[PDB]
Amino acid sequence: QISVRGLAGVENVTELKKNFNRHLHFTLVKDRNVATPRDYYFALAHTVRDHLVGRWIRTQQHYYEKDPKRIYYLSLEFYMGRTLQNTMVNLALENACDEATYQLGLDMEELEEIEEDAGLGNGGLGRLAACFLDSMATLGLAAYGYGIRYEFGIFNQKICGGWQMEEADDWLRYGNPWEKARPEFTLPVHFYGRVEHTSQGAKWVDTQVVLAMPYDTPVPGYRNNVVNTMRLWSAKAPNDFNLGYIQAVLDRNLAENISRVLYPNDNFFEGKELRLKQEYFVVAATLQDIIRRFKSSTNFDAFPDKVAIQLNDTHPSLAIPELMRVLVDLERLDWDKAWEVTVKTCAYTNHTVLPEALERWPVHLLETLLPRHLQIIYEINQRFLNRVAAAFPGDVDRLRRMSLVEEGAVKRINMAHLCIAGSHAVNGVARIHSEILKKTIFKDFYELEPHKFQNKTNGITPRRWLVLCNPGLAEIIAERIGEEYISDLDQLRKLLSYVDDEAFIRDVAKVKQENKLKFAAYLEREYKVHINPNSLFDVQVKRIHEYKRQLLNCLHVITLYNRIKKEPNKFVVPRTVMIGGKAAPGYHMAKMIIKLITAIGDVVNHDPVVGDRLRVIFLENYRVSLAEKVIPAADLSEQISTAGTEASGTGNMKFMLNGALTIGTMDGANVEMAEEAGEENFFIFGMRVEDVDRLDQRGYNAQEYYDRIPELRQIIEQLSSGFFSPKQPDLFKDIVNMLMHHDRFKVFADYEEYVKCQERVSALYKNPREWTRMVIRNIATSGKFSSDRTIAQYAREIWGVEPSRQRLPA
Amino acid sequence: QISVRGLAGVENVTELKKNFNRHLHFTLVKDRNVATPRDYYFALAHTVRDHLVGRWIRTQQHYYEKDPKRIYYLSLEFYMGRTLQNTMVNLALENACDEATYQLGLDMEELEEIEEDAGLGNGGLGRLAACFLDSMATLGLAAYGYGIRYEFGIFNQKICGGWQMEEADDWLRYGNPWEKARPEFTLPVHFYGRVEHTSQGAKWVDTQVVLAMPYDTPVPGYRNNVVNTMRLWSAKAPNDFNLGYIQAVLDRNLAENISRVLYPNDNFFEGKELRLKQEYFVVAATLQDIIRRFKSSTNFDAFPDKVAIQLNDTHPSLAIPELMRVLVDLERLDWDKAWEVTVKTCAYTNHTVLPEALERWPVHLLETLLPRHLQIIYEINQRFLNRVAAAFPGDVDRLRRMSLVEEGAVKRINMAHLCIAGSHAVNGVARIHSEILKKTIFKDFYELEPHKFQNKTNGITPRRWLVLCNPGLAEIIAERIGEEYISDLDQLRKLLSYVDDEAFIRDVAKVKQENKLKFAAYLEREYKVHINPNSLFDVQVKRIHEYKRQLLNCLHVITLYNRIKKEPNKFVVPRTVMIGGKAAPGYHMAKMIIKLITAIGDVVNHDPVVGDRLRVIFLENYRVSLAEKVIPAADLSEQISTAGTEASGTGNMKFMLNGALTIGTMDGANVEMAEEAGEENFFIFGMRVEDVDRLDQRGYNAQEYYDRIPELRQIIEQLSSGFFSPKQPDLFKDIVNMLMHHDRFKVFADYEEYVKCQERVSALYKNPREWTRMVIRNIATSGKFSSDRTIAQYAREIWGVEPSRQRLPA
Ligand SMILES: Cc1ccc(-c2nnc([C@@H]3O[C@H](CO)[C@@H](O)[C@H](O)[C@H]3O)[nH]2)cc1
Ligand SMILES: Cc1ccc(-c2nnc([C@@H]3O[C@H](CO)[C@@H](O)[C@H](O)[C@H]3O)[nH]2)cc1
Ligand SMILES: *Cc1c(COP(=O)(O)O)cnc(C)c1O
Ligand SMILES: *Cc1c(COP(=O)(O)O)cnc(C)c1O
C-alpha cells in the first residue's frame, strides 16, 4: 500500500501465511471454523514474534563476545503500550503482514485493536522509559531496561454519572505473547532481619527471603537487527515459606503482593511500606544480575568501565547503598574504593521539583525493613557532610540543608540528596528545568560539585509517534525527502523548502482532515458521541493535576459558552474541546476536576442555541493506545502548566510532530520547542518563571482578578450558584474555594492572557492556508525532540559510549 | 530397541529431530551452547505435544457432529503424575523419540526425570480418576474429566531428624506444557447472597461472584487416535472486585484462594468453609458447561439421554441440588420433572465406610454460603422421607436414620444420603465393599430401592502400570503372546501355558532382578543409601493411616530383628523392608508412625550383628513417579488393612501386574485377587470381616494378646522403655497407649497369624523356581483388574453407552 511500510514480496507473504496457519493450529489449538478475532490476533502475534527470535539470540551472543560497556536503565515504570505494530514497523514487516492477512480474509487493523496496552506506568515518566528503550536499540547500545512486572498496571478508567471509577487492569488475562519467563534465573531478595558485627565486617542475618523471577521482553531497534532486553521481575515465595498447613500456603500472597500492582500516583509521593518493598525488590534483583554478568566476562576497578546504571528519578535510589553493601560486606572492598566505584557507575535523572513528589522516607521504615542500608546511608551522610564542612567552613546552615537526614517530627531520608551524593552526573529533563535545579532546589550541591550537573532535554521516538500512529503524514514526508528521517529526525528541516509548495500544503491539510474523520468515526462507534469534523480540535490529554491546569482550560470553555449565549447570531470558529486523563484514586481535587469537565459538557452539549459551534468531550481511559489515535487528529495542543512546574512534558512533542499548533506557557520543553520553530509560529502566553516569583514575593491574591475581570466573576458566580449542577448547587464549592483562597498554581493570573491568545488561534484557523503553513514550520523543526538525539547525548556525555547506526547481520 | 515401544522409521526420526530443534530455538529461545537438560526436556515435550493437536481437534469435532451421549466424571482430585512418557506410549512414538534424542546426543530417560508430577490428588481416589480417564479414551467414550486446577498439589515430603516436614508443591513454577488455558470460556460462580421469593419462583440475589477459568489438558487413548479432555477450573476475581484502591486490588486473593491448594487429607473429612467453596466452585462451573453443550446440539426430557454425571464420592454432591436449581429456578421446569431428569442423569460412587471420612456439612455453613441450595436440600429431604413413610408406615426410627438432615448439637447434612436419594445408581468399588454398603451403612436405602445398588470393582491402567513402568516385563510377555493384551488384559491368561517353560521362568526372574538393580542404584544416587539387591524386597507403599496398619508391619520388623539378636548365627532369608507414604499434616498419630519407622531403621541398619540380613528404609516423598520405580522392583506387596476398612485398594493391583506376591488380609479387592489367582498362590492371613464383628461384639481387649504372646510383650516393653529412642525414652508413649487401650484397628489381633504367614513367604523365597512359578500364576490372572474392564462395566450398566475399540482416522 504505502512506501514506508516496507515490501510485500511473494515469498515473504507466502511464508507468513503458512506460519499464521501453523500457529492457529498448533499453538492456539483452534480450527478456522470456531476461531474468533482474538484467536486471529494471537496467531499473527506469534507469527511476528518468531521473526524476533534469531535476532534476539544473536544480539545477546554478540554482547557476550564483544563485551561492550553495558547500560542498565532502572525504572519502576515502563509504559510500553501495544507491541504488535511496533514490532512490524521495526522489522519492516508491516506491508507483508497486511498482504498476508488480507489474503486470509482478515483486516489487520481490526486484529491490532485486540491487543491490550502494557500499562506499567502512570504517564510521562513511564513513557519516557519506553521511548528510551526504543532509541537505545536503534542506536546499537548494549542496554537493558529493568523493572517490575506488575500483575495490574494503571487502572482502567470508567466514567459513571460524570465521575471517575477505577477498574483493575487485568492485562495478563489472555496471556502476553511478547514476554518469556526465565524461572531458571530466579534470585533471592532479603527483607527485615538485623545487623550483626563480627571480626570481619557486618552481616545481615535473620532475613525474610522473597524470590525475584525474571520475564524478558524483546526490544527491537529500527531496521538494524538489534534486539535488546527489558527484564521485569515478578515476586515469588520460597517453597518452605511459612513452612496450620493450609494457612501457610495461603499466606504466600504476603510475599507475592510486592509485584501485584502499580502505584497509580503521578508526580506524588505516597510513603507506604509496600512501595518501599517494590523499590528494594527491583534494585536488589537487578544488581545481582549486573554483577553476575560482570564476573562472567574480582577486579572491581574496571566495574565502571563495563557498567553504567541510570536511575530514573529517585525510585531506584536504593541502588546506591545496595551496591555499597555488596562491595563492602560481600566482596570485602574497603569503603573508599567501593564508593569510588559506586559514584562512577551511577547517574541520576530528576523529573520534578514539586515538593509533594519528592521521596523522603521515614527512618523508622528503613530501620525495620532495611537495617543494613540505613547504616550505610548514615555513613554516606557523615562522609559527605565532612566534605561540605571542609569546603564551606563554619556554614552550619548549609550542613543542615544538605544533609541526607532531615530532622523534625519524624526523621526522614531525602532520597534526592542521596542520589546526588552517590552519582557522577545529575541531570534535568529540559533546559529551563535543569537551570531551576541549579538555582533553587539543588543550589547547595551545584556549588559544591558544579561538574555533576547536566541537562538532557527529553524526546519521543519517531517510530511509535509518527510512523506507527500517522502513516499518512509519514508517507507524504517520505515522498519529498526519502525515508532516512525516521532514524535521523533532523532531516525534517528539509521540509522548510516546501512551505510555499501548493501541493505539499494541500497534502498536509488532507492528511489532518483524514485523521480527524477517522477519529470522529472512532468516537461514534466505541462511545456513541457525535462530533463535527470541520471544527477546530482543541485537545488537552495528560494526567489530571492542579499544576497542569485543566481548570484554566475549563474557564476558557465556559467563557466561549457565555460569549455565545450573549451574542448567539455572531459567527465564531467552531471548536471541539477534548480533555482526557486519569486522576490518582486518592486525589480528591483531581476527581472533582473530571466531574466539572463532564458537568460543563452536560450543559454545553445540549444547549440548542450553541448548535455544533462548541462541543466539550471528556475522553475516557486515556492511555498510550488512545494517544496514538487522538494526537494525529488534533489541531491545537494545550500545554498550559504554570511556568516552573512541568519539568519537560513529552505530549507536547508528540503533538508538534503530528501537525498540531501549540498554545502554551514558557514551561519545560515548550521553551525549546518555541526556540526551534520560532516564537511567531507558537501561541505563547502567560507568566514566565520570573513573573511567578515576583507574584509569590508580593503575595498572590486571587480576589484582585475576580474584582477586575467581569467575565471571570460571571464564571465563578455560575460555579458557586449551581448553574453547572442544578440538583446539587454546592457541588463545586471545593473548587471555587481553592481558586479564590489557596491556589498554588495561579489559574486566575494567566486567565486574561490565555483568553486573548485563544482568540489569535481562532483568527488563524479561519485562514486554512496560513494555518497549514505554520504547521509545516512546526513539523519541520521538530527534529531536536527525537529520543534518538536525547539518548546520543546520554551516551556521549554520561555513559561514555558511542552510538552506532550500523546493522547487525540478519 | 524393544518391540512394544513402536517403530523408529527414518522419516519419523528425521521429522522429530527438526521439530525438536525448532522448539528449542523458537519456543524456548535458547541455542545449544547454553541449553540445560531442563530446556531439552521442554523441547521434547513441545515436540510430542504437537502430535496430539490434530487428533484433539478432530476428536472434539467428531463428538460435535455425531452428538453421542457425553460422560462427565466430576472429581476434586486427579492424580495424573508425569505426562511425557504416557503420551509417547499412547501415540506409539517412544522408540522414534528415543532414536531422535539419541542422535542429538541426549539420553531420553534423563529428560523424562525432569518433568514434575501433576500431583492433584492424595492417593488412591485421585489416581483412580486418572486411570479412568485413560481407559475412557482407550474405549472411545465421549468423556470429560472436570476438576480444579490447584496451584499447589499434594505437598512434597522431606524427612528431617526422622520426622515428616511439608513443603509446598510449586508444580507450575517452570510452566505446564500440557495444559491450554481457555480464558474465552470463563464462567461466573455465585456465593453468599440471599433468596427472594417472587410471583414466579425463587431468585438468588446479592451474591459475590468468582470467575471460573478453564484449562484443558489432552487425554490420549491407546493407539486409537482419540484425545479426550480434562477441564480444570481456576478461580479469578472479577475486575470490579472490591471496586482504598491498592488494598482492593490486593484483596483479589480472597476470591482466588479457592483454587490455591489441595486439601491433603486421605480418607478424612475436614469441614472447613474453603473446602465447601472448592466443592461448589467445581460443580457450578461444570454444570453450566454441561448445559451449554447440551443446548448447542429447550426439551430437557432428552437430557439424561445425552448426559451422564458420575460423582466421585460425595465431594461433588452439590451437583444434585445445583442441577435442580438450574432446572427449577432458571429453566422453569416443574419440580417433579426436574427431579426425574436429575435422578436419571446422576450416579454416585462411594469409596469409604470409615465414619470420620464421611461428609456431613454443618447447616449453618450452607445457610450462609449457599442459601438456595439449603432450601432445595430441605425440599428433597421432605419428599424423600414422604416416600419412606409410605413404604414403611409407622417406622419412625427409619425416618430418623434415613433423613438427609442429622439432628444433634449442630444440625448437619449427610451428603451420602443426598447422593443416594438423587442418583439412579450407587456403587461400591469392590465386591466385599459393595456388600458391606448393603448390609450396614446404607442398609435402609437398599431396602427402599434395591435396584440402585451395584458393584464396580476398581482397576488400574495397564498402559501406565505395565508398559510404561516395566517395559522389560511387557516385552517378554509380548514375545510369547503378542501385543493385543495391552488393550485387552484378559489375554494374560495365555501365560498359564508357560508356567512350566524353563525359558519363561528364567526371563521373568531376570526382569525382576534387573528392576531391583536399577532401583537399588536409584536409591544410592538420589539418597546415598546402600541396599542388598539379593534380599527379598518387602514393600508397603500407600498413605500413612491407622487402618492401613503400617504399625503391624513395624511389629513384624522388630520381631525379625529380635529373633536375629537372639540367634545371630542362624540363617534367615535377607530382607529389605521398604515403607513409604505421606501423612496428612494434621494427623498426629500418622506422623508418629513415620517417626517410629525411621527410629527402627536407625537401630536396625546400624547393628553390626544384623549385617545386611535386614534393612529398613523409609521411602521419602512417595508419589506416582516413585510408584513407577518401586513397584516393578518389589518381591512382596503388603496389603494388610483390617478386614472391612480398605474399600478396594489399587496399589495391590499394581503390584500383582508387576510380579510381586501379595501378603494380605481378606479386605477390599484382595478378596477378588485371591479368587482370580487361586488362594494357594496368595499369602492370606488374619481376621475376616465376620471375625472382626465377633471381636467387637465381645469387646476387643489388647491386654489379652500382650499377656499370651511373649514376643509381642518384648516389643511393647522395648517401645515403652526407650530402646528405639534413647535420648527421649517416652517418645512413643502415645503409640503404646493407643495399641494397648484404644486401637480401633486391632493390630495385636492379627499379629500371630501375620508373623506365621511371613515365615511361609520366606520359605518360598528360598526356592527361586517355585517363587517365580507362583509369580507367573499371579501375573497371568491379573486381567480382571484392568480399568478397561471397570470402565466397560460403568458404560454398560450405569451410563448406557457402548465402548468401542475402533480407531479414528489419523
Ligand atoms: C510516583 C511518581 C510517578 C511519576 C513521577 C514523575 N515525576 N516527573 C514526572 C514527569 O516526568 C516526565 C519525563 O521526564 C516529564 O516530561 C514531566 O514534565 C514530569 O512531570 N513524573 C513522580 C513520582
Ligand atoms: C478428602 C478425601 C480424600 C479421599 C477419600 C477417599 N475415600 N476412599 C478413598 C480410597 O479410594 C480408592 C479408590 O476407590 C480405594 O481403592 C481405597 O480403598 C479408598 O481408601 N479415598 C476420602 C476423602
Ligand atoms: C506522552 C504521554 C504522557 C505525557 O503527557 P504530558 O502531556 O507530557 O504529561 C502521558 N500519558 C500518556 C498515555 C502518553 O502517551
Ligand atoms: C496406587 C497409588 C495409591 C493407592 O495405593 P493403595 O495401596 O491402594 O492405598 C496411592 N498413592 C499413589 C502415588 C499411587 O500410585
For β-strands B614-619 and B575-580, DSSP reports them as parallel
Angle at B595 between CA B593 and CA B597, to 5 degrees: 70
Mark whether B402 and B545 lie in a shared domain: no
Rounded Cα–Cα distance for residues B70 and B426 (Å): 19
Cα–Cα dist B354/B350, whole Å: 11
Q: Are residues B777 and B799 in the same domain?
A: no
CA angle, residues B751, B754, B758, in degrees to nearest 5: 140
C-alpha–C-alpha distance, residues A505 and A493, integer Å: 16
Task: Name the residue type at position A303.
Answer: F
DSSP letter, residue A357: G
In this structure, are B405 and B464 located in the same domain? no
C-alpha cell at A475: 508517507
Q: Which residues of B319-335 are buried (b: 16+ CB within 10 A; e: fewer)?
A: bbbbbbbbbbbeeebee
Distance B654 CA to ligand 4 centre (A): 9
Q: Please write down the long-range contacts of B682-686, taking CB distance under 8 Å and 24 or more positions apart.
A: B682/B778, B683/B757, B683/B760, B683/B761, B684/B757, B685/B750, B685/B753, B685/B754, B685/B756, B685/B757, B686/B640, B686/B643, B686/B749, B686/B750, B686/B753, B686/B754
Residue nearest to atom 17 of ligand 1 (CA): A649
Pick from B566, B577, B568: nearest CA to B615? B577
Q: What angle do CA B382, B385, B387 make, to 5 degrees?
A: 115
DSSP 3-state of A193: coil
Closest CA to B662 of B632, B698, B637, B696: B637
A27 and A46: one domain? yes
- Residue A183 per-residue DSSP state: G
SS3 content of chain B, % helix, strand, coil (to 5): 55, 15, 30
Stretch (H or E) spanning B58: helix B37-66
The string of DSSP codes covering B603-642 is HHTT-TTTTTSEEEEEETT--HHHHHHHHHH-SEEEE-PP
End-to-end Cα spacing for chain A: 25
Do A41 and A111 touch, CB atoms closer than 8 A?
A: yes
Cell numbers at residue B250, please? 490486593
Domain ranges, residue A107? 1-459+787-810
How far apart CA B646 and CA A743 sit, in angstroms, is 80
| Statement to judge: residues B67 and B152 lie in one domain | yes
Say if residues B378 and B421 touch (Cβ distance below 8 Å). no
A83: nearest Cα among A24, A122, A134: A134
- Say if residues A157 and A490 touch (Cβ distance below 8 Å): no
- Sign of the C-alpha dihedral, residues A328, A331, A332, A337? negative
Yes or no: say if A709 and A689 are a contact pair by the CB < 8 Å rule: no
Q: How far is CA A303 from CA A287, A294, A297, A318, A328, in A?
A: 12, 7, 11, 18, 14
Helix (H), strand (E) at residue B288: helix B273-295
A565 is catalytic: no
* Cα–Cα nearest to A671, from A695, A645, A648: A648
Nearest to A745 by CA among A346, A356, A285, A324: A356
Measured between CB atoms, which of A243, A250, A260 is closest to B167? A243
Phi and psi angles of residue B50, each rounded to the nearest 5 degrees, phi first: -55, -35
Q: What is the resolution of this structure in A?
A: 1.8
Alpha carbon B750 to its chain centroid, in Å, reads 27
**Distance in angstroms (rounded) separating the CA atoms of residues A98 and B514:** 61
What is the maximum span of chain A, computed from C-alpha positions, in angstroms?
Answer: 90
Q: Which residues of B714-750 are buried (b: 16+ CB within 10 A; e: fewer)?
A: ebbebbbeebbbeeeeebbeebbebbbeebebbbbbb
Distances (CA, A) of A272 to A129, A265, A362, A639, B116: 24, 12, 10, 32, 39
Packed helices A94-103 and A37-66: angle between N→C axes, nearest 10 degrees = 150
Asked whether A579 and A540 are in contact (CB, 8 A), the reply is yes
Known catalytic membership, residue A777: no
Q: Is there a contact between A143 and A136 (Cβ–Cβ < 8 Å)?
A: yes
| Ligand 4 in reach of B664 Cβ (< 6 A) | no
The answer on A281 and A243 residing in a single domain is yes
Q: Which of B513, B537, B517, B534 is nearest to B525 (CA)?
A: B517
Query: What is the maximal distance between C-alpha atoms in chain B?
Result: 90
Contact A290, A342 (CB under 8 A): no
Using CB atoms within 10 Å of the CB of residue A696, give its burial: 0 to 12 exposed, 13 to 18 middle, 19+ buried. exposed
- Give yes or no for a contact between A507 and A228, defined as CB atoms under 8 angstroms apart: no
- Give the C-alpha separation, A686 to A553, whole Å: 13
Ligand 2, atom 11: nearest CA belongs to which residue? B125
Q: How far apart are the first and last CA of chain B?
A: 25
Q: Which residue's CA is minimally distant from atom 3 of ligand 1?
A: A266
* A156 interface with B at CB cutoff 8 Å: yes
d(CA A474, CA B38): 47
Computed on alpha carbons and rounded to an integer, the radius of gyration of chain B in Å comes to 27
Whether residues B253 and A253 touch (CB distance < 8 A) is answered with yes
Handedness of CA A387, A389, A393, A397 (dihedral sign): positive
Q: Does B398 touch chain A (CB under 8 A)?
A: no
- Is the separation of the CB atoms in B736 and B720 below 8 Å? yes
How many domains in chain B?
A: 2
Kindly state whether B405 is in contact with chain A, defined as any CB-CB distance less than 8 angstroms.
no
CA–CA distance from A437 to each of A315, A350, A675, B774 (Å)? 18, 9, 21, 92
Q: How many whole angstroms from A142 Cα to the centroid of ligand 4?
A: 54
Dihedral sign computed on CA atoms, order A758, A759, A760, A763: positive
| Residue A792 DSSP one-character state | H
Distance CA A33, CA A419 (A): 59
Three-state secondary-structure class, residue B213: strand
Neighbours of B755 (CB within 10 A): 19
Pair A461, A446: CB distance under 8 Å: no
Residue B228's beta-bridge partner residues? B219
Q: B450 and B473 share a domain?
A: no
Position of cell 465393599?
Answer: B433
* Active-site residue, B518 included: no
Measure the CA–CA gap between A288 and B368, rounded to whole angstroms.
50
* 3 state DSSP class of B295: helix
Nearest CA-CA partner of A143 in A75, A215, A74, A70: A70
Looking at the structure, do residues A704 and A746 belong to the same domain, yes or no? yes
Q: Output the nine-digit C-alpha cell for B685.
A: 492371613
How deeply is B104 buried, as exposed, middle or buried, from its count of CB atoms within 10 A (0-12, 13-18, 19+)?
A: middle
Q: Do residues B808 and B58 make contact, with C-beta atoms less than 8 angstroms apart? A: yes
For residues A400 and A529, membership in a common domain is answered with no
Residues B376, B325: contact at Cβ < 8 Å?
yes
> Ligand 2 center to residue B266 CA distance, Å?
7
Rounded-to-integer distance, Cα B104 and Cα B476, Å = 29
Centroid of ligand 3 to alpha carbon of A310 (angstroms): 21
State residue B726 phi and psi, 5-degree precision: -55, -40
**How many other C-beta atoms are found inside a 10 Å radius of the C-beta of residue B53?**
18
Amino acid identity for residue A51 in this structure: H
Q: Which residues pair with A210 in a beta bridge?
A: A189
Q: What is the CATH number of the domain that holds A34?
A: 3.40.50.2000
Instruction: Identify the CA nearest to B109 among candidates B780, B591, B628, B498.
Output: B628
CB A345 within 8 A of CB A799: no
- How many CB atoms lie under 10 A from the CB of residue B243? 19
Q: What is the DSSP letter of B460?
A: B
Half-sphere exposure for A565 (CA within 13 Å, toward CB): 12
Q: Which three cell numbers stand for residue A401?
A: 540543608
* Beta-carbon count within 10 A of A395 CB: 14
CA distance A202 to A196: 6
Residues A663 and A792 in one domain: no
Cell of B738: 493407643
* Alpha carbon of residue B85 to chain centroid: 19
- The Cα–Cα gap between A34 and A43 comes to 14
| Residue in the structure block whose three cell numbers are 474429566 | B145
Q: Which residue has the cell 493437536?
A: B53
Beta bridge partners of A82: none
As beta bridge partners, residue B405 has B413
Find, among A216, A236, A234, A218, the residue nearest to A226 by Cα: A218
Q: Which residues contact A759 (CB under 8 A, 6 or more apart)?
A: none
Residue type, A709: I
In degrees, rounded to 5, the angle at the alpha carbon of residue A626 between the alpha carbons of residues A133 and A582 is: 90
Measured CA to CA, the distance from residue A565 to residue A431 in angstroms comes to: 43
From A241, A249, A261, residue closest to B246, measured CB to CB: A261
- Candidates A345, A359, A367, A360; CA nearest to A422 is A345
Q: How far apart are CA B587 and CA B673, in angstroms?
A: 31
The partner residues of B616 in beta bridges, in order of sequence, read B577
SS3 A122: coil
Ligand 3 in contact with A214 (CB < 6 A)?
Answer: no
Domain co-membership, B485 together with B517: yes
- d(CA B625, CA B580) in angstroms, rounded, equals 13
**Atom 13 in ligand 2: residue holding the nearest Cα:** B125
Residue A662 pairs with which residues in a beta bridge?
A637
Matching residue, cell 500440557: B178
Long-range Cβ contacts of A203-211 (<8 Å, 24+ apart): A203/A329, A204/A325, A204/A329, A204/A371, A204/A372, A208/A255, A209/A238, A210/A235, A210/A236, A210/A237, A210/A238, A210/A255, A210/A258, A210/A281, A211/A186, A211/A187, A211/A235, A211/A236, A211/A237, A211/A238
Q: Are A785 and A677 in contact (CB under 8 A)?
A: no
Beta strands in A262-372 (DSSP E): 307-312, 346-349, 360-362
Shared domain for B752 and B797, answered yes or no, is: no
Q: Rounded to whole angstroms, how far apart are CA atoms A692 and A745?
A: 9
The DSSP code sequence of A493-521 is GGGGGGTT-HHHHHHHHHHHHHHHHHHHH
d(CA A75, CA A567) in angstroms, rounded, equals 53
B15 lies within 8 A of chain A by CB: no
Beta bridge partners of A158: A165
Assess contact for A668 and A674: CB atoms under 8 A.
no
A69 touches B at CB < 8 Å = no
